[PDB]
Amino acid sequence: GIFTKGDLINIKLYVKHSLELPFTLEGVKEYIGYNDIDIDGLKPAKMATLFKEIHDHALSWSGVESKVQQQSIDLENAGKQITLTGDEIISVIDQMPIIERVKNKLGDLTDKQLAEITYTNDDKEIAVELGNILESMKKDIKRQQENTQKVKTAVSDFKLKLIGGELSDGTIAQGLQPQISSKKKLMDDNNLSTTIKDLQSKIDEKNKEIDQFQKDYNEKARKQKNKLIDEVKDLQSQVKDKSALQTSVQNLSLSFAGIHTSMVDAEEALNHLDFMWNTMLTQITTSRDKFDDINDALKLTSFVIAFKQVIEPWRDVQGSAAQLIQTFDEALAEYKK
């Protein structure tokens, strides 16, 4: 399928790296490297809120993955059931002569079993009569459409919380990735280095004055020399503080670049997985809508044509479900290795 093992690997790597991040105020303050900053966007409270949101998203991924795997198994089983039963029914109806195929209608077969053909629904209930089989299959297809829709909603909500958009409940959610980008831009466009350079230039001029005074005198100049010494001491303490803060901000920018890279890699994978589940949901909806065209008054030839149209998408559905199962097994084994 279009969703590869590398895609799931990228998603799981993003989840792991996001779980390695701290989510408490003290842990956030230790990670960012400061307890306070003059920049309101980089305040520790906002950073802690963003980290906590990322942490909750990473926690939600496990439930999303489980839902995807469980519904893929269910779709493979339901597709095998529907395909095999429908093929048996179609072959049995095709074996009878053309004259009965044209004169008889579907209703002439609904009240009796079609040559020991049986169908078991999602509630483990068995149906033997053809009409009961068709109604049970219709209900199963509707329920599988609902379940596939729920899984697609889960995957879409995960991806939208990552990149941004309107969630399933109508809530407008700003993506965690653009928020990471905004914070990184705040880290990269500030005047910390400017203040550092200005203070350092003042200190260098005063140090040149101190050097010249020391070289030249050894009374009024002595007091000026000591005044310059005290001024240099104060400005140097300020420079040390601001230099530590600026180094922390620069390193945090690097860390946020890494977070952004991981989020970007996960985004493509989520796009692929969402597309695959949407394709399967569309095929199931096509099957349900075609089943809506079945009635007892139809001739056996028309019924065979319509029922072929009904059960055709389930072949692709079960193929895609088996592909998802295989890719998940391979990717999880490779991640455990």
Side-chain angles (χ1 to χ4, degrees), residues 2-3 17 26 63 65 114 117 153-154 179-180 189 220 226 233 256 264 306 309 323 325-326 333:
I2 186 176
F3 185 72
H17 291 170
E26 189 68 19
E65 175 181 326
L114 190 57
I117 289 175
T153 290
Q179 283 178 318
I180 288 286
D189 191 6
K220 193 65 181 186
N226 285 81
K233 180 180 181 179
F256 267 53
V264 164
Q309 293 187 61
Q323 268 173 359
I325 293 304
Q326 186 178 10

PDB file of all heavy atoms in Angstrom, residues 2-3 17 26 63 65 114 117 153-154 179-180 189 220 226 233 256 264 306 309 323 325-326 333:
ATOM      1  N   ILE A   2       0.162   2.417  -0.139  1.00  0.00           N
ATOM      2  CA  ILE A   2       0.867   3.696  -0.146  1.00  0.00           C
ATOM      3  C   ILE A   2       1.394   4.043   1.244  1.00  0.00           C
ATOM      4  O   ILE A   2       2.354   4.812   1.369  1.00  0.00           O
ATOM      5  CB  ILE A   2      -0.047   4.806  -0.705  1.00  0.00           C
ATOM      6  CG1 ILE A   2       0.719   6.121  -0.863  1.00  0.00           C
ATOM      7  CG2 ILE A   2      -1.247   5.020   0.197  1.00  0.00           C
ATOM      8  CD1 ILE A   2      -0.099   7.227  -1.492  1.00  0.00           C
ATOM      9  N   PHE A   3       0.806   3.475   2.295  1.00  0.00           N
ATOM     10  CA  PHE A   3       1.300   3.643   3.658  1.00  0.00           C
ATOM     11  C   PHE A   3       2.337   2.557   3.919  1.00  0.00           C
ATOM     12  O   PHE A   3       1.995   1.378   4.047  1.00  0.00           O
ATOM     13  CB  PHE A   3       0.152   3.568   4.661  1.00  0.00           C
ATOM     14  CG  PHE A   3       0.558   3.860   6.077  1.00  0.00           C
ATOM     15  CD1 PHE A   3       0.882   5.146   6.471  1.00  0.00           C
ATOM     16  CD2 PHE A   3       0.603   2.846   7.020  1.00  0.00           C
ATOM     17  CE1 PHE A   3       1.250   5.415   7.779  1.00  0.00           C
ATOM     18  CE2 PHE A   3       0.973   3.109   8.328  1.00  0.00           C
ATOM     19  CZ  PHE A   3       1.295   4.395   8.707  1.00  0.00           C
ATOM     20  N   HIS A  17      10.190  10.596  20.557  1.00  0.00           N
ATOM     21  CA  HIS A  17      10.912  11.837  20.813  1.00  0.00           C
ATOM     22  C   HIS A  17      10.043  12.846  21.550  1.00  0.00           C
ATOM     23  O   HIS A  17      10.559  13.643  22.343  1.00  0.00           O
ATOM     24  CB  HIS A  17      11.424  12.428  19.500  1.00  0.00           C
ATOM     25  CG  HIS A  17      12.509  11.620  18.859  1.00  0.00           C
ATOM     26  ND1 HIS A  17      12.964  11.863  17.581  1.00  0.00           N
ATOM     27  CD2 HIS A  17      13.230  10.569  19.321  1.00  0.00           C
ATOM     28  CE1 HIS A  17      13.917  10.998  17.282  1.00  0.00           C
ATOM     29  NE2 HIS A  17      14.097  10.202  18.321  1.00  0.00           N
ATOM     30  N   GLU A  26       8.647  22.662  36.171  1.00  0.00           N
ATOM     31  CA  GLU A  26      10.050  22.595  36.564  1.00  0.00           C
ATOM     32  C   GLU A  26      10.886  21.887  35.505  1.00  0.00           C
ATOM     33  O   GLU A  26      11.992  22.336  35.177  1.00  0.00           O
ATOM     34  CB  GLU A  26      10.184  21.892  37.917  1.00  0.00           C
ATOM     35  CG  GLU A  26      11.578  21.969  38.524  1.00  0.00           C
ATOM     36  CD  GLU A  26      11.961  23.374  38.956  1.00  0.00           C
ATOM     37  OE1 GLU A  26      11.055  24.218  39.129  1.00  0.00           O
ATOM     38  OE2 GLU A  26      13.170  23.636  39.128  1.00  0.00           O
ATOM     39  N   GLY A  63      -3.604   4.844  21.342  1.00  0.00           N
ATOM     40  CA  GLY A  63      -4.986   4.479  21.101  1.00  0.00           C
ATOM     41  C   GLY A  63      -5.347   4.547  19.631  1.00  0.00           C
ATOM     42  O   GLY A  63      -6.092   3.701  19.123  1.00  0.00           O
ATOM     43  N   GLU A  65      -3.321   4.012  17.063  1.00  0.00           N
ATOM     44  CA  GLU A  65      -2.714   2.850  16.420  1.00  0.00           C
ATOM     45  C   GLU A  65      -3.500   1.579  16.715  1.00  0.00           C
ATOM     46  O   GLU A  65      -3.729   0.757  15.816  1.00  0.00           O
ATOM     47  CB  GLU A  65      -1.262   2.707  16.880  1.00  0.00           C
ATOM     48  CG  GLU A  65      -0.550   1.463  16.373  1.00  0.00           C
ATOM     49  CD  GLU A  65       0.880   1.366  16.877  1.00  0.00           C
ATOM     50  OE1 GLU A  65       1.531   2.419  17.043  1.00  0.00           O
ATOM     51  OE2 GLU A  65       1.350   0.236  17.121  1.00  0.00           O
ATOM     52  N   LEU A 114     -30.257 -21.004  -0.042  1.00  0.00           N
ATOM     53  CA  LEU A 114     -29.668 -21.206  -1.364  1.00  0.00           C
ATOM     54  C   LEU A 114     -28.559 -22.245  -1.272  1.00  0.00           C
ATOM     55  O   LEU A 114     -27.403 -21.918  -1.008  1.00  0.00           O
ATOM     56  CB  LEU A 114     -29.150 -19.888  -1.922  1.00  0.00           C
ATOM     57  CG  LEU A 114     -28.724 -19.916  -3.388  1.00  0.00           C
ATOM     58  CD1 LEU A 114     -29.878 -20.391  -4.256  1.00  0.00           C
ATOM     59  CD2 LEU A 114     -28.245 -18.543  -3.830  1.00  0.00           C
ATOM     60  N   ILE A 117     -25.877 -22.555   1.692  1.00  0.00           N
ATOM     61  CA  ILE A 117     -25.015 -21.385   1.833  1.00  0.00           C
ATOM     62  C   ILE A 117     -25.433 -20.652   3.100  1.00  0.00           C
ATOM     63  O   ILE A 117     -26.628 -20.433   3.331  1.00  0.00           O
ATOM     64  CB  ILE A 117     -25.090 -20.464   0.602  1.00  0.00           C
ATOM     65  CG1 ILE A 117     -24.407 -21.120  -0.599  1.00  0.00           C
ATOM     66  CG2 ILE A 117     -24.457 -19.109   0.898  1.00  0.00           C
ATOM     67  CD1 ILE A 117     -24.546 -20.333  -1.887  1.00  0.00           C
ATOM     68  N   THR A 153     -11.976   9.193  11.565  1.00  0.00           N
ATOM     69  CA  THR A 153     -12.090  10.380  12.401  1.00  0.00           C
ATOM     70  C   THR A 153     -10.951  10.446  13.410  1.00  0.00           C
ATOM     71  O   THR A 153     -10.374  11.516  13.634  1.00  0.00           O
ATOM     72  CB  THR A 153     -13.443  10.385  13.113  1.00  0.00           C
ATOM     73  OG1 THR A 153     -14.490  10.617  12.164  1.00  0.00           O
ATOM     74  CG2 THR A 153     -13.487  11.448  14.196  1.00  0.00           C
ATOM     75  N   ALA A 154     -10.606   9.309  14.020  1.00  0.00           N
ATOM     76  CA  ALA A 154      -9.503   9.288  14.981  1.00  0.00           C
ATOM     77  C   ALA A 154      -8.186   9.676  14.315  1.00  0.00           C
ATOM     78  O   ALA A 154      -7.436  10.522  14.826  1.00  0.00           O
ATOM     79  CB  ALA A 154      -9.399   7.907  15.628  1.00  0.00           C
ATOM     80  N   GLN A 179       3.014  26.010  15.871  1.00  0.00           N
ATOM     81  CA  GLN A 179       3.380  26.625  17.146  1.00  0.00           C
ATOM     82  C   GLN A 179       4.866  26.455  17.437  1.00  0.00           C
ATOM     83  O   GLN A 179       5.520  27.384  17.929  1.00  0.00           O
ATOM     84  CB  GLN A 179       2.540  26.037  18.279  1.00  0.00           C
ATOM     85  CG  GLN A 179       1.124  26.580  18.344  1.00  0.00           C
ATOM     86  CD  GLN A 179       0.304  25.942  19.445  1.00  0.00           C
ATOM     87  OE1 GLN A 179       0.367  24.731  19.654  1.00  0.00           O
ATOM     88  NE2 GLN A 179      -0.456  26.755  20.169  1.00  0.00           N
ATOM     89  N   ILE A 180       5.416  25.276  17.138  1.00  0.00           N
ATOM     90  CA  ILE A 180       6.858  25.079  17.251  1.00  0.00           C
ATOM     91  C   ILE A 180       7.595  26.063  16.350  1.00  0.00           C
ATOM     92  O   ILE A 180       8.598  26.669  16.750  1.00  0.00           O
ATOM     93  CB  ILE A 180       7.223  23.619  16.920  1.00  0.00           C
ATOM     94  CG1 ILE A 180       6.773  22.679  18.040  1.00  0.00           C
ATOM     95  CG2 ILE A 180       8.718  23.474  16.696  1.00  0.00           C
ATOM     96  CD1 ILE A 180       7.635  22.756  19.281  1.00  0.00           C
ATOM     97  N   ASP A 189      14.570  35.773  16.335  1.00  0.00           N
ATOM     98  CA  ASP A 189      14.417  37.193  16.009  1.00  0.00           C
ATOM     99  C   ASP A 189      14.195  37.967  17.309  1.00  0.00           C
ATOM    100  O   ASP A 189      13.060  38.274  17.679  1.00  0.00           O
ATOM    101  CB  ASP A 189      13.273  37.397  15.019  1.00  0.00           C
ATOM    102  CG  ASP A 189      13.236  38.799  14.448  1.00  0.00           C
ATOM    103  OD1 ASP A 189      14.162  39.587  14.734  1.00  0.00           O
ATOM    104  OD2 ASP A 189      12.278  39.114  13.711  1.00  0.00           O
ATOM    105  N   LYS A 220      43.511  62.752  40.411  1.00  0.00           N
ATOM    106  CA  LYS A 220      42.178  62.784  39.817  1.00  0.00           C
ATOM    107  C   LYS A 220      41.975  61.616  38.861  1.00  0.00           C
ATOM    108  O   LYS A 220      40.897  61.009  38.826  1.00  0.00           O
ATOM    109  CB  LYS A 220      41.954  64.116  39.100  1.00  0.00           C
ATOM    110  CG  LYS A 220      40.504  64.385  38.725  1.00  0.00           C
ATOM    111  CD  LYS A 220      39.638  64.539  39.965  1.00  0.00           C
ATOM    112  CE  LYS A 220      38.181  64.773  39.594  1.00  0.00           C
ATOM    113  NZ  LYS A 220      37.345  65.064  40.793  1.00  0.00           N
ATOM    114  N   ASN A 226      39.493  53.932  39.084  1.00  0.00           N
ATOM    115  CA  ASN A 226      38.723  53.038  39.949  1.00  0.00           C
ATOM    116  C   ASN A 226      37.232  53.076  39.611  1.00  0.00           C
ATOM    117  O   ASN A 226      36.540  52.049  39.685  1.00  0.00           O
ATOM    118  CB  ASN A 226      38.967  53.392  41.415  1.00  0.00           C
ATOM    119  CG  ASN A 226      40.328  52.929  41.900  1.00  0.00           C
ATOM    120  OD1 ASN A 226      41.339  53.591  41.667  1.00  0.00           O
ATOM    121  ND2 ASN A 226      40.361  51.783  42.572  1.00  0.00           N
ATOM    122  N   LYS A 233      33.081  46.168  36.136  1.00  0.00           N
ATOM    123  CA  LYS A 233      32.611  45.018  36.906  1.00  0.00           C
ATOM    124  C   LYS A 233      31.100  44.844  36.775  1.00  0.00           C
ATOM    125  O   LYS A 233      30.606  43.737  36.511  1.00  0.00           O
ATOM    126  CB  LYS A 233      33.013  45.170  38.373  1.00  0.00           C
ATOM    127  CG  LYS A 233      32.566  44.017  39.259  1.00  0.00           C
ATOM    128  CD  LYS A 233      33.001  44.218  40.701  1.00  0.00           C
ATOM    129  CE  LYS A 233      32.566  43.053  41.578  1.00  0.00           C
ATOM    130  NZ  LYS A 233      32.998  43.227  42.992  1.00  0.00           N
ATOM    131  N   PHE A 256      14.269  23.030  18.967  1.00  0.00           N
ATOM    132  CA  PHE A 256      12.979  23.205  18.311  1.00  0.00           C
ATOM    133  C   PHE A 256      13.059  22.895  16.824  1.00  0.00           C
ATOM    134  O   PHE A 256      12.091  22.387  16.250  1.00  0.00           O
ATOM    135  CB  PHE A 256      12.453  24.619  18.551  1.00  0.00           C
ATOM    136  CG  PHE A 256      11.556  24.721  19.746  1.00  0.00           C
ATOM    137  CD1 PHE A 256      11.972  24.248  20.979  1.00  0.00           C
ATOM    138  CD2 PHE A 256      10.286  25.261  19.636  1.00  0.00           C
ATOM    139  CE1 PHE A 256      11.146  24.321  22.081  1.00  0.00           C
ATOM    140  CE2 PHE A 256       9.456  25.339  20.738  1.00  0.00           C
ATOM    141  CZ  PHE A 256       9.887  24.867  21.959  1.00  0.00           C
ATOM    142  N   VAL A 264       7.527  17.160  10.872  1.00  0.00           N
ATOM    143  CA  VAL A 264       7.392  17.171   9.418  1.00  0.00           C
ATOM    144  C   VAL A 264       7.422  15.750   8.876  1.00  0.00           C
ATOM    145  O   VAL A 264       6.615  15.381   8.012  1.00  0.00           O
ATOM    146  CB  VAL A 264       8.495  18.039   8.784  1.00  0.00           C
ATOM    147  CG1 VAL A 264       8.614  17.751   7.293  1.00  0.00           C
ATOM    148  CG2 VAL A 264       8.218  19.517   9.029  1.00  0.00           C
ATOM    149  N   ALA A 306     -26.419  -6.472  -9.940  1.00  0.00           N
ATOM    150  CA  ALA A 306     -26.414  -5.539  -8.819  1.00  0.00           C
ATOM    151  C   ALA A 306     -25.597  -6.074  -7.649  1.00  0.00           C
ATOM    152  O   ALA A 306     -24.847  -5.326  -7.014  1.00  0.00           O
ATOM    153  CB  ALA A 306     -27.848  -5.241  -8.381  1.00  0.00           C
ATOM    154  N   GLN A 309     -21.951  -5.721  -8.249  1.00  0.00           N
ATOM    155  CA  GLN A 309     -21.574  -4.343  -7.942  1.00  0.00           C
ATOM    156  C   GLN A 309     -21.487  -4.110  -6.437  1.00  0.00           C
ATOM    157  O   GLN A 309     -20.647  -3.331  -5.975  1.00  0.00           O
ATOM    158  CB  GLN A 309     -22.564  -3.371  -8.582  1.00  0.00           C
ATOM    159  CG  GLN A 309     -22.519  -3.371 -10.099  1.00  0.00           C
ATOM    160  CD  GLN A 309     -23.389  -2.295 -10.705  1.00  0.00           C
ATOM    161  OE1 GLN A 309     -23.179  -1.103 -10.474  1.00  0.00           O
ATOM    162  NE2 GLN A 309     -24.383  -2.708 -11.483  1.00  0.00           N
ATOM    163  N   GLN A 323      -2.951  -5.548   3.636  1.00  0.00           N
ATOM    164  CA  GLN A 323      -1.724  -4.776   3.466  1.00  0.00           C
ATOM    165  C   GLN A 323      -1.400  -3.974   4.718  1.00  0.00           C
ATOM    166  O   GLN A 323      -0.242  -3.920   5.146  1.00  0.00           O
ATOM    167  CB  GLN A 323      -1.837  -3.846   2.259  1.00  0.00           C
ATOM    168  CG  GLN A 323      -1.320  -4.435   0.960  1.00  0.00           C
ATOM    169  CD  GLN A 323      -1.608  -3.545  -0.234  1.00  0.00           C
ATOM    170  OE1 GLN A 323      -2.212  -2.482  -0.097  1.00  0.00           O
ATOM    171  NE2 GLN A 323      -1.171  -3.974  -1.412  1.00  0.00           N
ATOM    172  N   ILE A 325      -2.297  -4.661   7.793  1.00  0.00           N
ATOM    173  CA  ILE A 325      -1.876  -5.596   8.835  1.00  0.00           C
ATOM    174  C   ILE A 325      -0.421  -6.002   8.626  1.00  0.00           C
ATOM    175  O   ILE A 325       0.389  -5.991   9.564  1.00  0.00           O
ATOM    176  CB  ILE A 325      -2.806  -6.821   8.864  1.00  0.00           C
ATOM    177  CG1 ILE A 325      -4.201  -6.407   9.329  1.00  0.00           C
ATOM    178  CG2 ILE A 325      -2.244  -7.900   9.773  1.00  0.00           C
ATOM    179  CD1 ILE A 325      -4.203  -5.718  10.671  1.00  0.00           C
ATOM    180  N   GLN A 326      -0.065  -6.348   7.386  1.00  0.00           N
ATOM    181  CA  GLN A 326       1.299  -6.778   7.091  1.00  0.00           C
ATOM    182  C   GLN A 326       2.303  -5.659   7.339  1.00  0.00           C
ATOM    183  O   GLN A 326       3.362  -5.888   7.935  1.00  0.00           O
ATOM    184  CB  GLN A 326       1.388  -7.268   5.645  1.00  0.00           C
ATOM    185  CG  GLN A 326       2.733  -7.868   5.264  1.00  0.00           C
ATOM    186  CD  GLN A 326       2.753  -8.391   3.837  1.00  0.00           C
ATOM    187  OE1 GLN A 326       1.826  -8.152   3.060  1.00  0.00           O
ATOM    188  NE2 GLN A 326       3.817  -9.104   3.484  1.00  0.00           N
ATOM    189  N   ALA A 333       7.909  -4.920  14.114  1.00  0.00           N
ATOM    190  CA  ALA A 333       9.070  -5.784  14.300  1.00  0.00           C
ATOM    191  C   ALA A 333      10.368  -5.021  14.061  1.00  0.00           C
ATOM    192  O   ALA A 333      11.331  -5.158  14.827  1.00  0.00           O
ATOM    193  CB  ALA A 333       8.976  -6.995  13.373  1.00  0.00           C
TER     194      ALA A 333
END
